Design an enzyme around this catalytic site. Structure first.
Site, PDB file in Angstrom:
ATOM      1  N   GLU A  30      -3.906  -6.992  -1.693  1.00 25.72           N
ATOM      2  CA  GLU A  30      -5.194  -6.457  -1.263  1.00 25.72           C
ATOM      3  C   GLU A  30      -5.724  -5.518  -2.340  1.00 25.72           C
ATOM      4  O   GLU A  30      -5.040  -4.548  -2.693  1.00 25.72           O
ATOM      5  CB  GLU A  30      -5.028  -5.750   0.078  1.00 25.72           C
ATOM      6  CG  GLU A  30      -6.320  -5.352   0.777  1.00 25.72           C
ATOM      7  CD  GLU A  30      -6.896  -4.039   0.298  1.00 25.72           C
ATOM      8  OE1 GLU A  30      -6.125  -3.166  -0.145  1.00 25.72           O
ATOM      9  OE2 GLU A  30      -8.128  -3.885   0.389  1.00 25.72           O
TER      10      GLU A  30
ATOM     11  N   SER B  53       7.010  -0.166   1.808  1.00 25.06           N
ATOM     12  CA  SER B  53       6.964   0.125   3.233  1.00 25.06           C
ATOM     13  C   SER B  53       7.291  -1.145   4.001  1.00 25.06           C
ATOM     14  O   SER B  53       6.667  -2.192   3.783  1.00 25.06           O
ATOM     15  CB  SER B  53       5.595   0.665   3.626  1.00 25.06           C
ATOM     16  OG  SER B  53       4.642  -0.379   3.723  1.00 25.06           O
TER      17      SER B  53
ATOM     18  N   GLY C   9       3.162  -6.833   6.013  1.00 19.17           N
ATOM     19  CA  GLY C   9       3.332  -8.200   5.568  1.00 19.17           C
ATOM     20  C   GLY C   9       3.646  -8.324   4.093  1.00 19.17           C
ATOM     21  O   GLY C   9       4.741  -8.755   3.721  1.00 19.17           O
ATOM     22  N   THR C  10       2.683  -7.953   3.245  1.00 20.53           N
ATOM     23  CA  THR C  10       2.866  -8.126   1.811  1.00 20.53           C
ATOM     24  C   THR C  10       4.029  -7.296   1.284  1.00 20.53           C
ATOM     25  O   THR C  10       4.830  -7.805   0.498  1.00 20.53           O
ATOM     26  CB  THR C  10       1.577  -7.789   1.054  1.00 20.53           C
ATOM     27  OG1 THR C  10       1.802  -7.923  -0.354  1.00 20.53           O
ATOM     28  CG2 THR C  10       1.102  -6.380   1.354  1.00 20.53           C
TER      29      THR C  10
ATOM     30  N   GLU D  40      27.432   4.692 -11.292  1.00 19.87           N
ATOM     31  CA  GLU D  40      28.510   5.399 -10.609  1.00 19.87           C
ATOM     32  C   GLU D  40      28.155   5.731  -9.171  1.00 19.87           C
ATOM     33  O   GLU D  40      28.347   6.864  -8.721  1.00 19.87           O
ATOM     34  CB  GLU D  40      28.872   6.666 -11.378  1.00 19.87           C
ATOM     35  CG  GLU D  40      29.438   6.423 -12.767  1.00 19.87           C
ATOM     36  CD  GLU D  40      29.713   7.713 -13.517  1.00 19.87           C
ATOM     37  OE1 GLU D  40      30.035   7.650 -14.722  1.00 19.87           O
ATOM     38  OE2 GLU D  40      29.610   8.794 -12.898  1.00 19.87           O
TER      39      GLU D  40
ATOM     40  N   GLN E 145       0.822  -1.205   0.000  1.00 14.00           N
ATOM     41  CA  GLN E 145       0.000   0.000   0.000  1.00 14.00           C
ATOM     42  C   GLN E 145       0.858   1.258   0.000  1.00 14.00           C
ATOM     43  O   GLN E 145       0.614   2.181  -0.785  1.00 14.00           O
ATOM     44  CB  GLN E 145      -0.946  -0.009   1.198  1.00 14.00           C
ATOM     45  CG  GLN E 145      -2.060   1.017   1.105  1.00 14.00           C
ATOM     46  CD  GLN E 145      -2.680   1.332   2.448  1.00 14.00           C
ATOM     47  OE1 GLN E 145      -2.646   2.470   2.908  1.00 14.00           O
ATOM     48  NE2 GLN E 145      -3.249   0.317   3.086  1.00 14.00           N
TER      49      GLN E 145
ATOM     50  N   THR F  30       2.347   2.553  13.800  1.00 19.31           N
ATOM     51  CA  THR F  30       0.953   2.282  13.467  1.00 19.31           C
ATOM     52  C   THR F  30       0.544   0.859  13.813  1.00 19.31           C
ATOM     53  O   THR F  30      -0.591   0.643  14.248  1.00 19.31           O
ATOM     54  CB  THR F  30       0.712   2.554  11.980  1.00 19.31           C
ATOM     55  OG1 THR F  30       1.092   3.902  11.676  1.00 19.31           O
ATOM     56  CG2 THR F  30      -0.752   2.363  11.629  1.00 19.31           C
TER      57      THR F  30
ATOM     58  N   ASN G 234       8.861   8.090   8.801  1.00 20.82           N
ATOM     59  CA  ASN G 234       7.844   9.122   8.615  1.00 20.82           C
ATOM     60  C   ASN G 234       8.016  10.287   9.585  1.00 20.82           C
ATOM     61  O   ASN G 234       7.631  11.421   9.273  1.00 20.82           O
ATOM     62  CB  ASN G 234       6.451   8.514   8.766  1.00 20.82           C
ATOM     63  CG  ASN G 234       6.119   7.533   7.666  1.00 20.82           C
ATOM     64  OD1 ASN G 234       6.723   7.552   6.596  1.00 20.82           O
ATOM     65  ND2 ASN G 234       5.148   6.664   7.922  1.00 20.82           N
TER      66      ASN G 234
ATOM     67  N   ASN H 110       4.562  11.883   0.489  1.00 19.11           N
ATOM     68  CA  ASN H 110       4.881  11.214  -0.762  1.00 19.11           C
ATOM     69  C   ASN H 110       5.333  12.199  -1.830  1.00 19.11           C
ATOM     70  O   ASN H 110       6.149  11.847  -2.685  1.00 19.11           O
ATOM     71  CB  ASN H 110       3.672  10.414  -1.238  1.00 19.11           C
ATOM     72  CG  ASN H 110       3.212   9.399  -0.219  1.00 19.11           C
ATOM     73  OD1 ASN H 110       4.011   8.643   0.330  1.00 19.11           O
ATOM     74  ND2 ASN H 110       1.914   9.382   0.049  1.00 19.11           N
TER      75      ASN H 110
HETATM   76  N1  LIG Z   1       5.566   7.225   4.029  1.00 15.79           N
HETATM   77  C1  LIG Z   1       4.455   6.501   3.968  1.00 15.79           C
HETATM   78  N2  LIG Z   1       4.337   5.354   4.725  1.00 15.79           N
HETATM   79  C2  LIG Z   1       3.205   4.611   4.672  1.00 15.79           C
HETATM   80  C3  LIG Z   1       2.158   4.993   3.856  1.00 15.79           C
HETATM   81  N3  LIG Z   1       1.170   4.090   3.990  1.00 15.79           N
HETATM   82  C4  LIG Z   1       1.570   3.140   4.867  1.00 15.79           C
HETATM   83  N4  LIG Z   1       2.827   3.453   5.308  1.00 15.79           N
HETATM   84  C5  LIG Z   1       3.640   2.680   6.262  1.00 15.79           C
HETATM   85  O1  LIG Z   1       3.495   1.298   6.005  1.00 15.79           O
HETATM   86  C6  LIG Z   1       3.480   0.564   7.215  1.00 15.79           C
HETATM   87  C7  LIG Z   1       2.604  -0.677   7.089  1.00 15.79           C
HETATM   88  O2  LIG Z   1       2.687  -1.220   5.792  1.00 15.79           O
HETATM   89  P1  LIG Z   1       1.598  -0.813   4.682  1.00 15.79           P
HETATM   90  O3  LIG Z   1       2.276  -0.262   3.452  1.00 15.79           O
HETATM   91  O4  LIG Z   1       0.636   0.198   5.254  1.00 15.79           O
HETATM   92  O5  LIG Z   1       0.810  -2.170   4.340  1.00 15.79           O
HETATM   93  P2  LIG Z   1       1.473  -3.265   3.371  1.00 15.79           P
HETATM   94  O6  LIG Z   1       2.923  -2.936   3.108  1.00 15.79           O
HETATM   95  O7  LIG Z   1       0.693  -3.321   2.086  1.00 15.79           O
HETATM   96  O8  LIG Z   1       1.347  -4.661   4.160  1.00 15.79           O
HETATM   97  P3  LIG Z   1      -0.095  -5.286   4.507  1.00 15.79           P
HETATM   98  O9  LIG Z   1      -0.531  -4.768   5.852  1.00 15.79           O
HETATM   99  O10 LIG Z   1       0.018  -6.787   4.557  1.00 15.79           O
HETATM  100  O11 LIG Z   1      -1.111  -4.887   3.462  1.00 15.79           O
HETATM  101  C8  LIG Z   1       2.957   1.520   8.267  1.00 15.79           C
HETATM  102  O12 LIG Z   1       3.694   1.380   9.458  1.00 15.79           O
HETATM  103  C9  LIG Z   1       3.158   2.905   7.689  1.00 15.79           C
HETATM  104  O13 LIG Z   1       4.134   3.600   8.428  1.00 15.79           O
HETATM  105  C10 LIG Z   1       2.268   6.148   3.090  1.00 15.79           C
HETATM  106  O14 LIG Z   1       1.344   6.498   2.366  1.00 15.79           O
HETATM  107  N5  LIG Z   1       3.419   6.901   3.149  1.00 15.79           N
HETATM  108  N1  LIG Z   2      37.171  21.854 -17.807  1.00 19.36           N
HETATM  109  C1  LIG Z   2      36.092  21.048 -17.664  1.00 19.36           C
HETATM  110  N2  LIG Z   2      36.141  20.045 -16.751  1.00 19.36           N
HETATM  111  C2  LIG Z   2      35.087  19.215 -16.570  1.00 19.36           C
HETATM  112  C3  LIG Z   2      33.885  19.418 -17.385  1.00 19.36           C
HETATM  113  N3  LIG Z   2      33.002  18.474 -17.016  1.00 19.36           N
HETATM  114  C4  LIG Z   2      33.591  17.730 -16.049  1.00 19.36           C
HETATM  115  N4  LIG Z   2      34.832  18.170 -15.780  1.00 19.36           N
HETATM  116  C5  LIG Z   2      35.758  17.584 -14.782  1.00 19.36           C
HETATM  117  O1  LIG Z   2      35.796  16.167 -14.943  1.00 19.36           O
HETATM  118  C6  LIG Z   2      35.735  15.509 -13.675  1.00 19.36           C
HETATM  119  C7  LIG Z   2      34.803  14.312 -13.788  1.00 19.36           C
HETATM  120  O2  LIG Z   2      35.217  13.500 -14.884  1.00 19.36           O
HETATM  121  P1  LIG Z   2      34.199  12.459 -15.564  1.00 19.36           P
HETATM  122  O3  LIG Z   2      33.056  13.193 -16.216  1.00 19.36           O
HETATM  123  O4  LIG Z   2      33.680  11.470 -14.546  1.00 19.36           O
HETATM  124  O5  LIG Z   2      35.100  11.714 -16.671  1.00 19.36           O
HETATM  125  P2  LIG Z   2      34.570  10.358 -17.366  1.00 19.36           P
HETATM  126  O6  LIG Z   2      34.481   9.265 -16.331  1.00 19.36           O
HETATM  127  O7  LIG Z   2      35.538   9.944 -18.447  1.00 19.36           O
HETATM  128  O8  LIG Z   2      33.208  10.599 -17.968  1.00 19.36           O
HETATM  129  C8  LIG Z   2      35.225  16.527 -12.668  1.00 19.36           C
HETATM  130  O9  LIG Z   2      36.088  16.557 -11.526  1.00 19.36           O
HETATM  131  C9  LIG Z   2      35.253  17.865 -13.377  1.00 19.36           C
HETATM  132  O10 LIG Z   2      36.143  18.756 -12.703  1.00 19.36           O
HETATM  133  C10 LIG Z   2      33.907  20.533 -18.361  1.00 19.36           C
HETATM  134  O11 LIG Z   2      32.919  20.770 -19.091  1.00 19.36           O
HETATM  135  N5  LIG Z   2      35.013  21.277 -18.435  1.00 19.36           N
HETATM  136 MG   LIG Z   3      -2.278  -3.487   2.729  1.00 22.18          MG
END
Ligand SMILES: Nc1nc2c(ncn2[C@@H]2O[C@H](COP(=O)(O)OP(=O)(O)OP(=O)(O)O)[C@@H](O)[C@H]2O)c(=O)[nH]1
Ligand SMILES: Nc1nc2c(ncn2[C@@H]2O[C@H](COP(=O)(O)OP(=O)(O)O)[C@@H](O)[C@H]2O)c(=O)[nH]1
Ligand SMILES: [Mg+2]
Ligand SMILES: Nc1nc2c(ncn2[C@@H]2O[C@H](COP(=O)(O)OP(=O)(O)OP(=O)(O)O)[C@@H](O)[C@H]2O)c(=O)[nH]1
Ligand SMILES: Nc1nc2c(ncn2[C@@H]2O[C@H](COP(=O)(O)OP(=O)(O)O)[C@@H](O)[C@H]2O)c(=O)[nH]1
Ligand SMILES: [Mg+2]
Lengths: 430, 430, 140, 430, 430
Positions: free
Chosen positions: D62, D131, D135-136, D245, D11, D170, D197, D219
């Site tokens: 569910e 979450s 259970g599920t 990376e 859920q 909860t 949360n 969310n």
């Molecule tokens: N952040 C967030 N947490 C949620 C939300 N809904 C439920 N939860 C969390 O999920 C936990 C329980 O699991 P649920 O997702 O509600 O239910 P489920 O995972 O489908 O498992 P079942 O009970 O078997 O259906 C609760 O402790 C809540 O904290 C949500 O909308 N947002």
């Molecule tokens: N001078 C310059 N340096 C750059 C630019 N883009 C990235 N860098 C440098 O390149 C480094 C990262 O390298 P990266 O992109 O991972 O190289 P790659 O793994 O071969 O793709 C960073 O520390 C930047 O300082 C650019 O447009 N100009």
């Molecule tokens: Mg449920």
């Protein structure tokens, strides 16, 4: 570059920031929707100091707002320019501290601070070059004065070389709104001296006095006090966001205004300030600005600056003006008042010029002076603290959350030692 | 086949470099874009087709001034990558710009210097500009001079430093770094010229009749002095003088190379043409104590040697007839072991006028570079200012925590004491 | 773990033992500084660096993160040293209850010394067996 | 000439298959009827004229879910006789779906798999979804994997299993069948991806800001991960990666192939466009422990190898500048015998959006598949849960009476003990 | 006459060739349809070097394209100038290697290579007088590094007297895209030293550094790296296709740059390279070309050339210029840097002049220097190889396709012996 992030805590700090960011946005032409609609090119050159950039072209402040209760941040969002703040930066608890320092520093503030420290770390690690942090909080409240000061230590432990700013409102004995103010004021001053690179004290009593006497407006509200504090806050970092003849960042002020590492408690003031009916009478000239700048009633603190001697002083002029006049006036204000300037450090006034004035004004000045007259505030705070502590009043609230009286004794002793060693240099002679 | 390289470091250095580089471009007919619509070779270099590039480099840790330069009308002139800029300012801390943030920038500057030097074939020497009372300026100037003294060796370097005024000051900590930088350049620079701001303010007020001067007016006069000094290398004259022909004529001993300058005439177009501006009256005005470009009294000391440059239609016989009159006067006395003390240079090109500036167009001018025994007063007063705060070790923690050792302050004091003793020992008659 | 309250001499011995260890942060209040479990992980890592992955224990002001650090330390490290801290004792330590951490440090010290001695005996025995096998192969 | 076949059983498997199959049809422009109104060839096949048929099969005992599929809008797409359905549900009993009713259905599924495979010429590999805790699902997945491993041999199979959460469950009997299914797919599946949360619930809550999610939202994210994994096979890219990376880059040893995934960004359209979604911030978010797609802490173990895919307009230099920052951090540490552990892929096609879904449209995305040593915790906790009930032989009679032997439970326990010992043996440094 | 054929393998080699052939066609004025539309007579005189002639007057490159997967060649055909390649020369497999060296050299690469060797033999037997072969491939991939190197041995076995070129990209540890890079790099270097007459290493990290610092472009892509590599490739054979003062074919460089038969690993660089905004500032002169040519940051490899001493050097100047200036500058670059040149072989710099500059440029230089500083790359490659091999990680993938660990041990030993005997001459003195 050299930008700063903003971190505020408590109700008072949140209300201060709610106007500070409005002022900054109006200065930079940012609409309350985050879209720039400014006129001058300079409005965008240094916008990275306070604002970040997002997709769609809009700007977002890098401010972090923290409190132990959600009401104040839920209220500041509905105010003007409230949408600029990123919703992610809002961090809050569900309980509050109830003006109890222990709860906001040991039990509740300790667990929450991890989340705010996460976003603080996110903000600081990202920014181009950090300059530092700026902190706004109140010493009259529990959660603020606890969590902010513990966050100060946590930030300092991780950023030891950056600079740290704190704009701190201390509870005055004249206008008292909380009975437990001395306890959390004294506890907070203990931790604040050890970690903050700069501290700027602000008093509600001085703000009411200024509003009633200089502006002469009938009904002051918290919006006016917040506006004055916001203008003073913006004036400090103006040359860091705009060009000028002599740029001077926050670190340069830190070098020139702090003689010894433990003497970093300044009192500030803003000029010019004129009433609506007299704004046409006055003419804006450098002598007129400098005579109001050193005026005793113009200070943002009830401390009387002619009851002591200045260790050093600073001025941040704004607008386009001649430097020769500024230097000669600074010399004149120091020759005619030699009795109120300490004699073993010559030429103890720093000046700076920024060519961009505030919107709507042609000239403006921000004054930051380190004076020995600040001892009177700690004296009265400690006096109230020792009057209340000798009977162990309200002590059980603090002692029921893991705190003990030993930390109260150490805090009182350290605060008294600070008071003594701050005046030690007042009587020092060459 | 004769070249010179100018170094500009710090906010003041860059702001005076801008001032001299409008003047040179105007004097050689080069448009602000760098395009002409064989005398240019001293300051410029040919690119093969079209524009000219200055042989200058701008240095600063705080980016605001450089950004202002790179957006003005002269954005196309300077090479884009010789305007070296930092991120964090030294914030008036000398130890920062010599040990913490200047070291990471100095390598780029030295690479630029090498790249500029390999182009020159007849390098006469280096010029350097730096305001002494700042962190980055003094620190980077010291470090650059120390590196150049060993990279190149016997090449001549000239320093146009701006010392703080006797009483007028912008910072509060500038004596410390002024003394340290004097220590550094005492054993590393061949010529140092005094340029404090107060004397030039008085000159502007008295002669130019400007009551509200700004820094640009000061920098234009300094630029005119530089142009008068270097005119002999790029224009035909009846009596030429080279840069290398100075330590043989103005420097009696290797330690003594601090001298103070003067310029004449200084007059506005509104009343310039009513008087004839003869050579005798201008050479009398140049020797007036009130027209010294540094706030020092020559009547308080002897003269050692006077090198003074003319330009225009002046005839040598009129110059001799005026040197005789000065030798006649009883208020100006030379040292015993110097029978003749005058070196005279005559050039044909009259000084050029900058549009919208203060000075008018005249056919005769005189610039004097005079070495006198009276200069010890500025050292004595700077030493007195330094001792007051060094007695209590104030502001030292801002320097010890930036990598500098505790004992580094004392040896600068000892070197100043040695210099003051040497100046007294030289001035006594045999 | 219902361990008796420590006397002043035993407390001083534990503090001197902990001060002899180069920890990442200066100690100001042992009860608070150990409440996050990070300093106990560093203490054990100093003697047994292969037993403790110190990076798994983040500095913590929140009760939740302190409890995570302590549960992780208790299950992964202390259990391998042949002891475990009770939940109630962990709750006392994270709340900085007086004497709670000092009792745990005493038990940890004794268990650490025993664990190090047992590791030494195993190495000496293994080296004896390896040497005895080399002498038999030389004759072959 | 490159193909892949996806298997959906149970859920949860069917409900995530529906989720991925809307996305693929939408991404390749195919209407739900299967008609277009050369990249399709990876998942689809051309029928000669007109419609396309998916390379997928749906399994369940569910019938309810399949009947729902066969009446929805996608009734015309799938081939009528690849939706294999049973009559009686496993009812969370693993022994049923592995020994009793699954055996009579598995033959039809294998016949369908053969009929689909003979069509492909360049078969890359299989995908399976189930979450585990049912259970599920587990039983049928085990049986299908066991049949495929011998029918085809070296072809690669990938399993996207959904294990139960640490504490959230909860059913009550799911550890038994989870352990048995892990036994079955340990020696039979090349890659297994973790999908419990609870982690995805936290992801949705924190980022998507959904406070009431259903299974469809989960969310859809799983479907997006699947699409990101398989994009490189059907779109042009600067750095391609193939399915084959993987075992050369992520699988150090044949036994160790369980890894956990993450995805970024996850953000809604209401606040997505206010921020810029730079590559640095998304690659930071992908490595955050809180964004793991399985509830495991990576801070508790070492990394072995990280394979992470990008798609959109990302530039390789920005990818390298972000891999360096991650290598800098002290909270993420790799195994000693692996100096470099990153494999990077870059693709040009941006992720596609499903209408009415949660995710917004963005130009950049990152999907990481990371193999780490910390995965052993889920095995340990499942083992602990299993032992508690297997001590008293509870629920065993439901399994012994379905044809399974008594000793089958013990050997799964021994294999899990062997796997846990192997994971400990690999993670120790040399 | 004396023409060469082109052979490329892998994705990286194909992408390099896709730009190399575009550059060659643009240089010779060949349209993407194979029709000549050039301007100068010299454009056709020596076109037989790279292009063949077919009926209808069109030209076809004598290139051979090979890969283990069809995607890259199916993509290069749709690109610009993709129609020039003869469809018959395209050879590919249906499986791929997945970055596994064993698969691309023993199992899959062995069976496919017969077809590509057939067309290689067809191309070489036909041509007028063979000069040799040039190979482009990457050492970081499986299929490339395997099939290309085995093809090298197969070609060398049949044409022992011809010359062989290889342009090899080695995996740097900074920008790593594949986890199994050390294995196939070490295995490939073993075979490459035994058969290649010349080898030229290229690194992606150095290309990114160059693009960010010298060109100062914001967003590098693989197209820019390919363009730089293509310009460097074309610069080597320019004088073989155009007249010049001192013609020098590939064999003449082979004689003069390889002292001992096993020391044939060079690193290259191309000059000039300037930003778009500064292309008007600079003036193209021989000193300006030679100062950038020997610059350390200009090398196409991360290896630091001032960490060792040059055994020999070569330069291929392009454009019309005086030979006396070239010789004197070569002497000057060797007198001022005597510390970095080995002393027992005097006059170890070879120069050549070609009168035909690149299209759009007036002067250009290609630099090929044999230096001892290349040891650092093999050192780090072997370090990673021995860190990964000691645990036998990922070894089963290679050992499952007929390879054993003995070939790994021999490869490691031979590579270490090469590293040692390459530095043996660095410490040698006369
Ligand atoms: N952040 C967030 N947490 C949620 C939300 N809904 C439920 N939860 C969390 O999920 C936990 C329980 O699991 P649920 O997702 O509600 O239910 P489920 O995972 O489908 O498992 P079942 O009970 O078997 O259906 C609760 O402790 C809540 O904290 C949500 O909308 N947002
Ligand atoms: N001078 C310059 N340096 C750059 C630019 N883009 C990235 N860098 C440098 O390149 C480094 C990262 O390298 P990266 O992109 O991972 O190289 P790659 O793994 O071969 O793709 C960073 O520390 C930047 O300082 C650019 O447009 N100009
Ligand atoms: Mg449920
Ligand atoms: N004559 C002249 N002096 C200047 C000018 N600008 C700054 N100064 C002097 O420079 C001193 C401080 O150094 P600055 O040049 O302003 O700053 P800096 O040298 O860059 O050092 P930092 O503060 O670290 O940035 C002040 O005391 C000024 O007297 C200028 O434009 N003209
Ligand atoms: N300037 C200003 N001050 C405020 C405002 N609101 C409250 N305050 C001050 O903050 C103090 C109370 O601080 P509190 O709200 O308890 O701080 P907290 O404990 O961190 O929330 C009072 O004494 C007020 O004077 C405001 O809007 N503006
Ligand atoms: Mg400055």
């Amino acid at each position: 570059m050299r930008e700063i992030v903003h971190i505020q805590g408590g109700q008072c700090g949140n209300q201060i920031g709610a106007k500070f960011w409005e002022v900054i946005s109006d200065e930079h032409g940012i609409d309350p929707t985050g879209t720039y609609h400014g006129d001058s090119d300079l409005q965008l050159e240094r916008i990275n100091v306070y604002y970040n950039e997002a997709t769609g072209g809009r700007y977002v402040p890098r401010a972090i707002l923290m409190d132990l209760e959600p009401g104040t941040m839920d209220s500041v969002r509905a105010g003007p320019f409230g949408q600029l703040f990123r919703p992610d930066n809002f961090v809050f608890g569900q309980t509050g501290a109830g003006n109890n320092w222990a709860k906001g520093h040991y039990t509740e503030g300790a667990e929450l601070i991890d989340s705010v420290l996460d976003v603080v770390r996110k903000e600081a690690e990202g920014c181009d070059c950090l300059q530092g942090f700026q902190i706004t909080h109140s010493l009259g409240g529990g959660t603020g004065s606890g969590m902010g000061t513990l966050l100060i230590s946590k930030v300092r432990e991780e950023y030891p070389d950056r600079i740290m700013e704190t704009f701190s409102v201390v509870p005055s004995p004249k206008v008292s709104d909380t009975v437990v103010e001395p306890y959390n004021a004294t506890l907070s001053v203990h931790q604040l001296v050890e970690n903050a690179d700069e501290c700027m004290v602000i008093d509600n009593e001085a703000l009411y006095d200024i509003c009633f006497r200089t502006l002469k407006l009938t009904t002051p509200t918290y919006g006016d006090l917040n506006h004055l504090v916001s203008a003073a806050m913006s004036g400090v970092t103006c040359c860091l966001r705009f060009p000028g003849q002599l740029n001077s960042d926050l670190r340069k002020l830190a070098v020139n205004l702090i003689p010894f590492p433990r003497l970093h408690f300044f009192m500030i003031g803003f000029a010019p300030l004129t009433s609506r009916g007299s704004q046409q009478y006055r003419a804006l000239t450098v002598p007129e600005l400098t005579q109001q700048m050193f005026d005793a009633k113009n200070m943002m603190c009830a401390a009387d600056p002619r009851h002591g001697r200045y260790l050093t002083a600073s001025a941040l002029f704004r607008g386009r003006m001649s430097t020769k006049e500024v230097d000669e006036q600074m010399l004149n204000v120091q020759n005619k008042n030699s009795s109120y300037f300490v004699e073993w450090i010559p030429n103890n006034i720093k000046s700076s010029i920024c060519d961009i004035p505030p919107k709507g004004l042609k000239m403006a000045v921000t004054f930051v002076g380190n004076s020995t007259a600040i001892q009177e505030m700690f004296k009265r705070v400690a006096e109230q603290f020792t009057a209340m502590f000798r009977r162990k009043a309200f002590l059980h609230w603090y002692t029921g959350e893991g705190m003990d009286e030993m930390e109260f004794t150490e805090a009182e002793s350290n605060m008294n030692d600070l008071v003594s060693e701050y005046q030690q240099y007042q009587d020092a002679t060459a | 086949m004769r070249e010179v390289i100018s170094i500009h470091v710090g906010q003041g250095g860059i702001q005076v470099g801008n001032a001299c580089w409008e003047l040179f471009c105007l004097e050689h007919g080069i448009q602000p874009d760098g395009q002409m619509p064989d005398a240019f070779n001293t300051f410029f270099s040919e690119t093969g087709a079209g524009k000219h590039v200055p042989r200058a480099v701008f240095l600063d840790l705080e980016p605001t001034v450089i950004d202002e330069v790179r957006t003005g009308t002269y954005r196309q002139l300077f090479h884009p990558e010789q305007l070296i800029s930092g991120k964090e300012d030294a914030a008036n801390n000398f130890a920062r710009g010599h040990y913490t943030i200047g070291k990471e920038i100095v390598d780029l500057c030295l690479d630029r210097i090498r790249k500029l030097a390999d182009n020159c074939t007849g390098l006469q020497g280096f010029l350097v500009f730096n305001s002494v009372g700042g962190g980055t300026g003094s620190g980077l100037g010291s470090l650059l001079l120390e590196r150049l003294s060993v990279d190149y060796g016997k090449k001549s370097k000239l320093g146009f430093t701006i010392y703080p005024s006797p009483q007028v000051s912008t910072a509060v900590v500038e004596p410390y770094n002024s003394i340290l930088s004097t220590h550094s350049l005492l054993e590393h620079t061949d010529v140092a010229v005094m340029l404090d701001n107060e004397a030039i303010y008085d000159i502007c007020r008295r002669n130019l009749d400007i009551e509200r001067p700004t820094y640009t007016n000061l920098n234009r006069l300094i630029a005119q002095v530089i142009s008068s000094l270097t005119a002999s290398l790029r224009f035909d004259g009846a009596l030429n003088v080279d840069i290398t022909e100075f330590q043989t004529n103005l420097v009696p001993y290797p330690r003594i190379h601090f001298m103070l300058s003067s310029y004449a005439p200084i007059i506005s177009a509104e009343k310039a043409y009513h008087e004839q501006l003869s050579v005798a009256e201008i050479t009398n005005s140049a020797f007036e104590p009130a027209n010294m470009m540094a706030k020092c009294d020559p009547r308080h000391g002897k003269y050692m040697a006077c090198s003074m440059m003319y330009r225009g239609d002046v005839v040598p016989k009129d110059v001799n007839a005026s040197i005789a009159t000065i030798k006649t006067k009883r208020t100006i006395q030379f040292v015993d072991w110097c029978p003749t003390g005058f070196k005279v240079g005559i050039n044909y090109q009259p000084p050029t006028v900058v549009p919208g500036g203060d000075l008018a167009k005249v056919m005769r001018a005189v610039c004097m570079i005079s070495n006198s025994t009276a200069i010890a007063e500025v050292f004595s007063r700077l030493d007195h200012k330094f001792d007051l705060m060094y007695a209590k070790r104030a502001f030292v923690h801002w320097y010890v925590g930036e990598g500098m050792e505790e004992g580094e302050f004392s040896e600068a004091r000892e070197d100043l004491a040695a210099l003051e003793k040497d100046y007294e020992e030289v001035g006594i008659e045999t | 773990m219902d361990a008796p309250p420590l006397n002043e001499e035993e407390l001083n011995q534990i503090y001197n033992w902990i001060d002899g260890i180069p920890l990442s942060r200066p100690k100001k209040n042992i009860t608070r500084d150990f409440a996050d479990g990070c300093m106990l992980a560093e203490v054990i890592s100093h003697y047994c660096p292969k037993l403790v992955e110190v990076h798994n224990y983040s500095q913590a002001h929140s009760v939740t993160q302190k409890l995570y650090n302590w549960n992780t330390l208790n299950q992964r490290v202390l259990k391998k040293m042949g002891f475990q801290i009770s939940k109630n004792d962990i709750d006392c330590i994270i709340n900085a209850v007086p004497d709670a951490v000092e009792r745990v440090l005493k038990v940890c010290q004794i268990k650490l010394d025993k664990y190090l001695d047992d590791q030494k005996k195993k190495k000496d025995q293994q080296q004896y067996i390896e040497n005895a096998q080399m002498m038999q192969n030389g004759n072959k």
